[PDB]
């Protein structure tokens, strides 16, 4: 156990989904590539944790509304 | 006081031969790498020297 | 569980008993035969290798910790 995302990654993911919904997609690697340039994240570890949550929310939003 | 016995006893070696270069104490002295430093003094001056506790 | 007084060497009663009964049962080890015959066990090592040189038993393992022999195959 212990795979809970922090509010830092959670909030940042919701922002970038709202501001760039079109450019994102269902692929994690594509998401971490677009997140590489649109936002300035210093850490790669933080970078792909954000993209991991974004790919998780992309599946949710394609089949139902979410909080964002 | 008289010259013959004021420094008659040698200290070429042992714990009294060595002292801290900041405070002249003779306990907990680090001699590695030519440091010659009282250990509490070394913990004080480590950052200026260049020692970093990476982990 | 008081004492063992294991025999350092053979005598009239044991030497013949070893030569007549040892190559008959399945497990022939210095430990087993020393328990059965109350012999020392350093004697058991010397006796078993002499029995092996006499052709009455066949070697199985030949290890430093334990050497194991067995009876000949009947035929």
């Amino acid at each position: 156990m212990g795979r809970v995302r922090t509010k830092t990654v959670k909030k940042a993911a919701r922002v970038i989904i709202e501001k760039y919904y079109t450019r994102l997609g269902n692929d994690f690697h594509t998401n971490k590539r677009v997140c590489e340039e649109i936002a300035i994240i210093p850490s790669k570890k933080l970078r792909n944790k954000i993209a991991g949550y974004v790919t998780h929310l992309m599946k949710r939003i394609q089949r139902g509304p979410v909080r964002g | 006081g008289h010259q013959q016995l004021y420094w008659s006893h040698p200290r070429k070696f042992g714990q009294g031969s060595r002292s801290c270069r900041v405070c002249s104490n003779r306990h907990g002295l680090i001699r590695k790498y030519g440091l010659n430093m009282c250990r509490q003094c070394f913990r004080q001056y480590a950052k200026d020297i260049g020692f970093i506790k990476l982990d | 569980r008081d004492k063992l007084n294991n025999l350092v060497l053979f005598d009239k009663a044991t030497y013949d008993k070893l030569c007549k009964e040892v190559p008959n049962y399945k497990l022939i080890t210095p430990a087993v035969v020393s328990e059965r015959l109350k012999i020392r066990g350093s004697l058991a090592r010397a006796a078993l290798q002499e029995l092996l040189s006499k052709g009455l038993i066949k070697l199985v393992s030949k290890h430093r910790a334990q050497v194991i022999y067995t009876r000949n195959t009947k035929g």
């Binding site: - | - | 350092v8 053979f10 005598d11 030497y15 020392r40 006796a47 002499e50």
Partner: protein, 145 residues
């Protein structure tokens, strides 16, 4: 050839002034003498030029007398001086080895002359304490109580 015990066997036999076992190996059995260890036993039987795989009860009479003269006169048979007990002795300055109660007599001699000269070591001996400078605050209480 790994046969029975011989007729000329001693199950218990007397060497010097005390008894030594027979069922044990020759070198490891003669060490029962008060003054011979396993090194001394091996090096005198090697100079005695006899077997080492046979027990003490296999020691025929001429072997018995052979090895006792060796162990009583070691230096005369090219045993090195540094192998000995009483090397460069305090009485005669003569190398020798002490055996049986002869060890006990030389041991007693040192102890009584140490008390006689009133050295610190002898005083500790007399008081039943340690002599080699080891501490006594925590250990050794079994020897007193």
């Amino acid at each position: 050839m790994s046969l029975v015990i011989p007729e000329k066997f001693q199950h218990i036999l007397r060497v010097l002034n005390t008894n030594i076992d027979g069922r044990r190996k020759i070198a490891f059995a003669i060490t029962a003498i008060k003054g011979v260890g396993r090194r001394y036993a091996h090096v005198v039987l090697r100079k005695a030029d006899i077997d080492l795989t046979k027990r003490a009860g296999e020691l025929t009479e001429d072997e018995v007398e052979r090895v006792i003269t060796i162990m009583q006169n070691p230096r005369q048979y090219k045993i090195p001086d540094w192998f000995l007990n009483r090397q460069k002795d305090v009485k005669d300055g003569k190398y020798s080895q002490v055996l049986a109660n002869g060890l006990d007599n030389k041991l007693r001699e040192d102890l009584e002359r140490l008390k006689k000269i009133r050295a610190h070591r002898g005083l500790r001996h007399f008081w039943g304490l340690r002599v080699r400078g080891q501490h006594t605050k925590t250990t050794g209480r079994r020897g007193r109580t």
